[PDB]
Amino acid sequence: MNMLALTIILPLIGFVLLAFSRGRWSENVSAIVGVGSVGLAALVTAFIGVDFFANGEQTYSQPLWTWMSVGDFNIGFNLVLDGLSLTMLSVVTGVGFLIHMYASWYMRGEEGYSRFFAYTNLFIASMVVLVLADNLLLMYLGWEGVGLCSYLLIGFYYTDPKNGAAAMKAFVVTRVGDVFLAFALFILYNELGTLNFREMVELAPAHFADGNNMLMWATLMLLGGAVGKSAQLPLQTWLADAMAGPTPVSALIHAATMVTAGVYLIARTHGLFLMTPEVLHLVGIVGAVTLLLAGFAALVQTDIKRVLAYSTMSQIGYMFLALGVQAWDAAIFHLMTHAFFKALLFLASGSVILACHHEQNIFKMGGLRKSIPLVYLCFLVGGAALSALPLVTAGFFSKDEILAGAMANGHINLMVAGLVGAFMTSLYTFRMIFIVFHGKEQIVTHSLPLIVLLILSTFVGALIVPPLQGVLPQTTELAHGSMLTLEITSGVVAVVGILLAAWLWLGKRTLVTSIANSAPGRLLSTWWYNAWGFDWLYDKVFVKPFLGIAWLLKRDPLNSMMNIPAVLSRFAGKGLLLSENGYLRWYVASMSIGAVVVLALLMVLR
Amino acid sequence: MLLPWLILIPFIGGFLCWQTERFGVKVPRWIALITMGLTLALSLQLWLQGGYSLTQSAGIPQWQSEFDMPWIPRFGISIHLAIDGLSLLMVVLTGLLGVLAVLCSWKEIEKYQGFFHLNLMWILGGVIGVFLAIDMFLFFFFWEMMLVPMYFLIALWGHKASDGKTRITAATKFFIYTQASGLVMLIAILALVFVHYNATGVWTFNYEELLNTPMSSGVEYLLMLGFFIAFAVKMPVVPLHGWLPDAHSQAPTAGSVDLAGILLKTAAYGLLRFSLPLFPNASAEFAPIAMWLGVIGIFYGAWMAFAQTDIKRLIAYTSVSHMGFVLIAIYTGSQLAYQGAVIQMIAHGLSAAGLFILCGQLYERIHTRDMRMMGGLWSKMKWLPALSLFFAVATLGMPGTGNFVGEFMILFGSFQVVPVITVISTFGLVFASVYSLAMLHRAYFGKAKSQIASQELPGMSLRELFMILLLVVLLVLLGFYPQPILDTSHSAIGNIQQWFVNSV
Ligand SMILES: CCCCCCCCCCCCCCCCCC(=O)OC[C@H](COP(=O)(O)OCCN)OC(=O)CCCCCCCCCCCCCCCCC
Ligand SMILES: CCCCCCCCCCCCCCCCCC(=O)OC[C@H](COP(=O)(O)OCCN)OC(=O)CCCCCCCCCCCCCCCCC
Ligand SMILES: CCCCCCCCCCCCCCCCCC(=O)OC[C@H](COP(=O)(O)OCCN)OC(=O)CCCCCCCCCCCCCCCCC
Ligand SMILES: CCCCCCCCCCCCCCCCCC(=O)OC[C@H](COP(=O)(O)OCCN)OC(=O)CCCCCCCCCCCCCCCCC
Ligand SMILES: CCCCCCCCCCCCCCCCCC(=O)OC[C@H](COP(=O)(O)OCCN)OC(=O)CCCCCCCCCCCCCCCCC
Ligand SMILES: CCCCCCCCCCCCCCCCCC(=O)OC[C@H](COP(=O)(O)OCCN)OC(=O)CCCCCCCCCCCCCCCCC
Ligand SMILES: CCCCCCCCCCCCCCCCCC(=O)OC[C@H](COP(=O)(O)OCCN)OC(=O)CCCCCCCCCCCCCCCCC
Ligand SMILES: CCCCCCCCCCCCCCCCCC(=O)OC[C@H](COP(=O)(O)OCCN)OC(=O)CCCCCCCCCCCCCCCCC
Ligand SMILES: CCCCCCCCCCCCCCCCCCCC
């Protein structure tokens, strides 16, 4: 368990080697270095998990050095490992390793092979720093590194300026989230004097006995950082545009690393949120609203990868809903299962893109279950796990745990929102599946990760239980009758949604075309297609005034205001040079004028 | 003891650079390299022998080394040098940047290279003397003395693609700004000395003696205003800033002049060493105005940097925004914010040095600085766009670089003192990420927007790559292990902070 820092050192070494290789090595050697760095990190993670379970699930601490020490400001470079950290670390390392083998197969013949693998290795190292840190500033280091690697990997095809614009939009929105997280850090250090998670939880109830308002501010700013990183309301607009990068980038961002950081942040600082119940209820409300908006947005997307992006937003909203109803174990279980099936879905969509030679929209496809049967099978099991198909998928058990935690804690409206979102999830998922893979046809390094993610997307993934006892509090248990009727309701809702998608899109689209061609239907489709106009609102409220103020200030008005005395001096000198006309009689006249002035002044002031 | 040699080795080396040009045209660069290497080695020897990490705060004055000699005994003026942790860090940074400036102008085989090296050495010696002098007249003397070689370097050796008249205009504007503000500082120094003389009867310019000077409220405010006007011109603080982009634009193409005196931050040191201890009550009263000027400087510099089509002017306005952050840190009265300000000054020096060296080599390859005429340069160059990406990532304040450590300790201490200014400054960090990403997108990503950007370009030299990678290593080590730097400056920062808050 003393090799806990090796899970960061190996991806860092891979990034350094592949960055300084500069593409001069062979693609086999670059693939060996990158995939082997992430695989060795995963193997060290497996050994760490074996040691952790052999030691009775004891929280392990490994300091490395002291990051900074100015008086009472003490930030250490210390890693910690409990059940939550082990769960996130195993998910990140294993799913990133599978995505790395798929990228080694996928990115063959591309410019920037070594650069791609260096950036993904740095992404893995940053997320391991994020999940292994024991204080908020080291977690902020991992947070910002994850955001930077997201920016570097989204705009990987740098020749197209649209990819670059998507990368800058993702980085700017997540940077706003990180500024909110920085506000949380400043409040927590100013109040408690520490940023260590355990010490903050220990010192908070004694410090906030009289007043609790600054703790509410700190938890609200933590929620702001979380929704910035996890693409939730109101910082969700970056995800759909940021999907312009390569397919393994999207799999890594949406499944393993990038969007799970907010859920991990809320789960790690769960005690501080427990002392501020209104902010935790706001976390649940934000998750419910985000999942509903994301489901409605994914219902009308014409792109496979855009549907997958809004489905990721919906599932992260489900995780936030589980956090808000104090179902922490349900949230982490859904995080791990969603990582599995979302990685499977994104790799299958990349296989579709490579097979179709160009990124088509879903209506130009049809009858793809005959050209690619294995890709269709992977897509079918991934969509069944996404839609929470009962008794054969892990997503069903995860969403059942989330809804049971919501119902058992007295949150009825959040449970209703979760049920409606599950119905919509099955609706949009099998809408996209039936449009793409049904209709009339028009046009070892990768099978193994797809097979592993296929197996983990079934009930075998639900057989893996994260060791969250002793780290997160246990959710209040539901009665057997209530649990049974809730499982029945969830299965019925998912099956009815799949059947409605089959009735609407599997046959000829007549009632769907009747709805879409109607003026309310066109208006609602246009509204939901642009993700409810949030990007338009942020363009008209933040981007356009920024550009206008930059255009107004581009001539440096303060510089000209300070250049005004030079202009006045030049004008005064030119005006004073008129007296030097060279005329002697004027010089005598000016002498007599000065004599009059001097004598008059002397008689005045006497 | 070694402090006069720390000042005098640059001046003697510059004289030898000018004189030894008769033996060859490639001779003065070796003399300048030996000179700045010796100065850096002496500074590192002072760092090792000083024992700064074990030094505790004993109150102002507390000097780890001190030198005194009479200069003008009629006014009580002495060549009076003193070094402690903050001064030592600034002197080490000056020596390192001088070595980088010598190496950056290695390939210039001009017929008057000896005078170029003499001017560079005299600028470096003046900056070291500014950091070392604790005599008010000597401090002013070095402050104004290091501006004449800089004027002649900008006006005569400057950006050769531009017209001569633009170079003379930029050099004249820089000289007028700096020297007029210095004259205002001289008036403040003279009036403080006269107040001390009328209260004591002793002709002194010693900063240790002027610390305990009984002043009326309002007189102290005016003396503080004169000092702050000088330091605000050379920080820069808005609106006394435009000389810095005009001087960076018309600096010589290598970038050695950029590293020599335009980039070393003597004004924040002067604010910490002189403005706060001499006038603590006036600084405490001036604090809201100073932190709001810092906020305006952060956002104005960020917006100006975004609006530039010139990459050099973008880096200059980046420096303006960072100095707004440091100016906020100085007036908080917090130990954490002061240590963050020290880290931020060192990190800004390293990162801006890397950015200016990379900009100079980019201009060497492509013969233009307009970002509208480049684009997609990642595929055309071997090393330059990746290192430019690293340094632009550093200047937006990425953790792992020292800029993050500096600005975040600044913001932690400032939030402990003033929360609203802190939250506005963090949104300034969002603005910083915006302008750094904009520069990276406009320069190295996308498609080629002209003909010169569409051709393959020669790779960087081994020496150029060596010093850029040295800056990269130093920035990463400052990001991950800033504790030696924090321990070096801890006692001086503690003395300044205790003097500031124990007399208000
Ligand atoms: C954030 C990622 C995870 C962390 C590892 C990598 C971090 C970035 C690597 C580059 C910068 C490293 C700077 C620090 C190196 C270690 C030196 C150090 O801090 O020593 C202090 C400590 C002994 O002194 P102690 O008293 O315990 O410390 C408290 C302070 N008095 O020392 C010890 O106790 C021993 C510590 C040994 C640490 C070895 C780390 C090796 C890392 C190799 C990385 C290779 C790639 C480098 C570039 C990466 C990208 C920037
Ligand atoms: C720490 C754990 C994670 C926690 C979060 C950390 C977040 C902050 C991380 C900061 C580090 C810098 C991040 C951005 C670096 C980007 C560099 C890059 O793009 O390198 C790729 C490039 C090769 O790409 P390619 O396109 O094939 O080549 C150019 C075309 N011929 O490469 C090259 O062209 C050559 C190499 C260029 C520079 C590489 C990176 C330098 C900085 C890191 C290493 C510093 C040195 C190591 C030792 C440090 C001190 C011990
Ligand atoms: C999903 C969840 C999302 C949640 C989002 C919530 C809305 C956004 C909130 C942003 C700011 C949050 C600040 C939270 C921390 C506040 C901590 C604090 O101390 O608050 C109190 C402080 C006033 O303190 P004071 O009255 O001095 O007394 C306190 C002790 N004596 O009061 C303050 O510090 C409040 C300061 C508010 C400043 C608002 C205006 C600035 C906005 C950005 C400006 C910068 C960008 C624009 C460009 C400016 C160019 C000049
Ligand atoms: C500025 C615009 C931003 C973007 C749009 C935001 C829309 C927000 C819509 C919801 C309104 C705000 C949240 C609810 C009101 C405020 C909280 C409240 O009064 O809650 C009462 C109640 C729960 O009360 P109780 O369980 O007793 O709480 C104890 C814990 N403190 O009940 C609840 O908390 C009910 C929460 C239900 C879940 C929210 C989503 C469903 C209900 C709203 C539907 C419309 C939402 C927008 C469209 C979505 C797609 C259809
Ligand atoms: C207690 C609550 C219990 C549950 C109540 C119901 C919950 C919501 C259920 C919504 C889904 C119902 C299923 C049928 C409609 C959706 C499927 C459909 O017909 O889609 C058609 C079209 C998109 O089809 P497409 O494939 O893009 O078109 C191909 C041809 N061009 O789609 C369109 O063009 C738009 C279709 C809109 C259909 C009606 C939507 C009604 C709900 C709107 C909520 C708005 C937000 C809340 C209110 C805000 C304030 C007004
Ligand atoms: C164009 C650029 C330059 C700007 C113009 C030139 C400088 C203008 C300075 C104006 C000063 C106005 C003073 C008005 C009050 C005079 C009467 C008075 O109150 O005298 C008090 C005192 C004499 O009585 P005493 O017993 O000595 O008390 C000691 C008090 N400490 O008096 C004293 O002890 C002496 C007080 C001296 C005050 C400081 C004067 C210089 C301060 C620095 C420069 C001005 C401020 C910064 C620049 C402003 C904007 C350009
Ligand atoms: C060719 C044409 C163009 C070129 C020429 C342009 C004009 C050049 C000259 C401009 C400056 C004019 C003189 C400014 C100083 C005035 C001093 C003054 O009025 O002092 C009065 C009083 C003296 O103090 P007193 O009250 O006597 O103290 C003893 C008991 N308390 O003072 C006080 O009590 C305190 C007063 C403080 C405020 C007055 C000073 C304002 C300075 C403005 C500039 C600096 C603003 C702040 C920093 C901005 C950023 C650098
Ligand atoms: C939401 C409720 C809570 C509020 C939280 C705070 C606000 C969140 C806002 C989120 C959305 C931000 C979207 C930013 C998108 C930026 C990326 C983009 O669109 O880039 C396009 C453009 C590219 O520029 P360039 O590099 O020149 O490219 C060459 C040709 N395109 O790039 C540009 O034109 C540059 C765009 C710069 C945008 C700057 C945004 C600053 C945000 C400051 C937030 C302040 C909050 C407080 C406000 C006051 C409150 C009292
Ligand atoms: C003024 C110039 C400053 C340059 C940046 C310096 C940054 C600090 C580097 C310190 C060394 C870090 C790597 C070695 C760690 C040694 C640990 C010693 C204690 C065990």
Q: HEC profile for A378-389?
A: HHHHHHHHHCCC
Written as one string, the DSSP assignment of A21-59 is HTT-S-HHHHHHHHHHHHHHHHHHHHHHHHHHHHTTSPP
Tokens of B307: 């609006």
Tell the residue nearest (CA) to atom 16 of ligand 9.
B481
> Which residue, A446, A349, A455, A342, is CA-closest to A31?
A446
Chain breaks in chain A (C to N over 2.5 A) after: 443
Ligand 5 atom nearest the C-alpha of A521 is 34
Tokens of B417: 């003192």
- Phi and psi for A15 in degrees, rounded to 5? -65, -45
| A533 within ligand 5 shell (Cβ under 6 A) | no
- Closest partner CB to B378 (pick from A158, A161, A189): A158
Our CA dihedral for B460, B466, B471, B472, rounded to 10 degrees, sits at 80
Tokens of B317: 């306005």
The number of helix segments (H) and strand segments (E) in chain A equals 27, 2
Q: Which residues pair with A81 in a beta bridge?
A: A60
Tokens 């209506």: give the residue.
A363
How buried is residue B54: exposed, middle or buried, by Cβ count under 10 Å (0-12/13-18/19+)?
exposed
| Residues listed for chain A | 606
> Residues of B389-425 as b/e, b for ≥16 C-beta within 10 angstroms?
bbbbbbbbbbbbbbbbbbbbbbbbbbbbbbeebbbbb
Any chain A CB within 8 A of the CB of B476? no
What does the alpha-carbon distance between residue A275 and residue A345 come to, in Å, rounded to a whole number?
38
Amino acid at B393: V
Q: Is A61 left (phi over 0), alpha (psi -120 to 50) or beta?
A: beta
Written as one string, the DSSP assignment of A282-312 is HHHHHHHHHHHHHHHHHHT--SHHHHHHHHH
Any chain A CB within 8 A of the CB of B399? yes
> Which residue, A92, A375, A536, is CA-closest to A383?
A375
Tokens of A396: 């069903």
Q: What are the angstrom distances between the C-alpha of A271 and each of A563, A578, B429?
A: 57, 81, 29
- Closest partner CB to A65 (pick from B304, B379, B481): B481
CA-based Rg of chain A, rounded to a whole angstrom?
Answer: 30
- Phi and psi for A74 in degrees, rounded to 5? -130, 110
Q: Which residue of B lies nearest to A560 if distances are taken between CA atoms?
A: B242
Of the residues A237, A275, A281, A314, which should be mutated to test ligand 4's pocket, given the most ligand atoms within 8 Å of the CB?
A: A281
What does the alpha-carbon distance between residue B53 and residue B60 come to, in Å, rounded to a whole number?
18
Tokens of A240: 């759909």
> Which residue, B463, B466, B474, is CA-closest to B105?
B463
Number of C-alpha atoms within 13 angstroms, CB side, residue A586? 6
Q: Is the dihedral of CA A267, A273, A275, A278 positive or negative?
A: negative
Q: Which residues pair with B60 in a beta bridge?
A: none
Q: CB count, 10 Å around CB of B75?
A: 14
Contact A116, A30 (CB under 8 A): no
A-to-B residue pairs, Cβ atoms closer than 8 angstroms: 126
Q: What are the angstrom distances between the C-alpha of B110 and each of A130, B21, B113, B115, B116?
A: 53, 11, 5, 10, 9
What does the alpha-carbon distance between residue A139 and residue A394 come to, in Å, rounded to a whole number?
30
Residue A377, C-beta contacts closer than 8 angstroms, at least 6 positions apart = A454
3-state secondary structure of B65: strand
Q: Which helix (H) or strand (E) holds B78?
A: strand B77-83
Residue B256, C-beta contacts closer than 8 angstroms, at least 6 positions apart = B101, B102, B104, B105, B120
CB contact under 8 A, A182 and B426: yes
What does the alpha-carbon distance between residue A40 and residue B458 come to, in Å, rounded to a whole number?
38
Tokens 């390939």: give the residue.
B107
What does the alpha-carbon distance between residue B382 and residue A345 come to, in Å, rounded to a whole number?
37
Contact B178, B147 (CB under 8 A): yes
| A509 within ligand 5 shell (Cβ under 6 A) | yes
What does the alpha-carbon distance between residue A293 and residue A299 come to, in Å, rounded to a whole number?
10
Written as one string, the DSSP assignment of B247-282 is HHHTS-TTSHHIIIIISS-HHHHHIIIIIHHHSHHH
Cα of A178 vs centre of ligand 8, distance in Å, is 14
Any chain A CB within 8 A of the CB of B306? yes
Tokens of A368: 């793809």
> Which residue, B213, B327, B340, is CA-closest to B277?
B213
Contact A109, A101 (CB under 8 A): no
> Which residue, B153, B178, B294, B299, is CA-closest to B244?
B178
Our CA dihedral for A348, A352, A354, A360, rounded to 10 degrees, sits at -140
Contact A334, A401 (CB under 8 A): yes
Tell the residue nearest (CA) to atom 41 of ligand 6.
B188
Q: What are the angstrom distances between the C-alpha of B372 and each of B104, B243, B358, B388, B452?
A: 26, 24, 18, 17, 12
Kindly report the CA angle at A454 between A115 and A457, in degrees rounded to 5?
Answer: 105
CB contact under 8 A, B404 and A144: yes
What does the alpha-carbon distance between residue B417 and residue B399 come to, in Å, rounded to a whole number?
24
- Reported resolution, Å: 2.5
Chain B residues with CB under 8 Å of A549 CB are 303
Contact B384, B460 (CB under 8 A): yes
Residues with CB under 6 A from ligand 9: B 89, 92-93, 96, 346, 474, 477-478, 481, 484-485
Any chain A CB within 8 A of the CB of B218? no
Q: Which residues pair with B66 in a beta bridge?
A: B82
Expressed in angstroms, the distance from the first to the final Cα of chain B is: 35
CA distance A500 to chain B (A): 45
Q: What are the angstrom distances between the C-alpha of B265 and each of A64, A337, A469, A564, B268?
A: 33, 53, 54, 27, 6
| A516 within ligand 7 shell (Cβ under 6 A) | no
> Which residue, A385, A550, A403, is CA-closest to A455?
A385
Tell the residue nearest (CA) to atom 51 of ligand 5.
A524
Q: CB count, 10 Å around CB of A587?
A: 12
CA-based Rg of chain B, rounded to a whole angstrom?
Answer: 22
Amino acid at B501: V
3-state secondary structure of A168: helix
Q: Which domains does chain A have, with CATH numbers?
A: 1-529 (no CATH), 530-605 (1.20.5.2700)
- Closest partner CB to A164 (pick from B400, B409, B445): B445
Q: CB count, 10 Å around CB of B220?
A: 21
E runs forming strands in A370-451? none
When scoring B445, B476, B483, B497 by the number of chain A Cβ atoms within 10 A, the one with the most, hence best to mutate, is B445
What does the alpha-carbon distance between residue A450 and residue A347 come to, in Å, rounded to a whole number?
7
Contact A34, A104 (CB under 8 A): yes
| A414 within ligand 4 shell (Cβ under 6 A) | yes
CA distance A242 to chain B (A): 15
CA distance B173 to chain A (A): 9
CB contact under 8 A, B303 and A71: no
Tokens 């990001």: give the residue.
B479
| A413 within ligand 4 shell (Cβ under 6 A) | yes
What does the alpha-carbon distance between residue B353 and residue B386 come to, in Å, rounded to a whole number?
16
Cα of B478 vs centre of ligand 9, distance in Å, is 7
Selected residues 421-450 of chain B with any CB under 8 Å from a CB in chain A: 422-423, 426-427, 429-430, 433-434, 437-438, 441, 444-447
CB contact under 8 A, A164 and B411: no
Contact A199, A134 (CB under 8 A): no
What does the alpha-carbon distance between residue A543 and residue A494 come to, in Å, rounded to a whole number?
40
Number of C-alpha atoms within 13 angstroms, CB side, residue B458? 9
Cα of B402 vs centre of ligand 3, distance in Å, is 26
What does the alpha-carbon distance between residue A319 and residue A178 come to, in Å, rounded to a whole number?
20
Q: What are the angstrom distances between the C-alpha of B196 and each of B193, B211, B212?
A: 5, 10, 9
Q: Which residues pair with A65 in a beta bridge?
A: A77
What does the alpha-carbon distance between residue A369 and residue A441 come to, in Å, rounded to a whole number?
9
Expressed in angstroms, the distance from the first to the final Cα of chain A is: 96
The residue range of the domain holding B468 is: 1-504
- Phi and psi for A113 in degrees, rounded to 5? -60, -50
3-state secondary structure A63-130: EEEEEEEECCEEEEEEEEECHHHHHHHHHHHHHHHHHHHHHHHHCCCCCCHHHHHHHHHHHHHHHHHH
Contact B57, B498 (CB under 8 A): yes
Looking at the structure of chain B, the number of domains it has is: 1
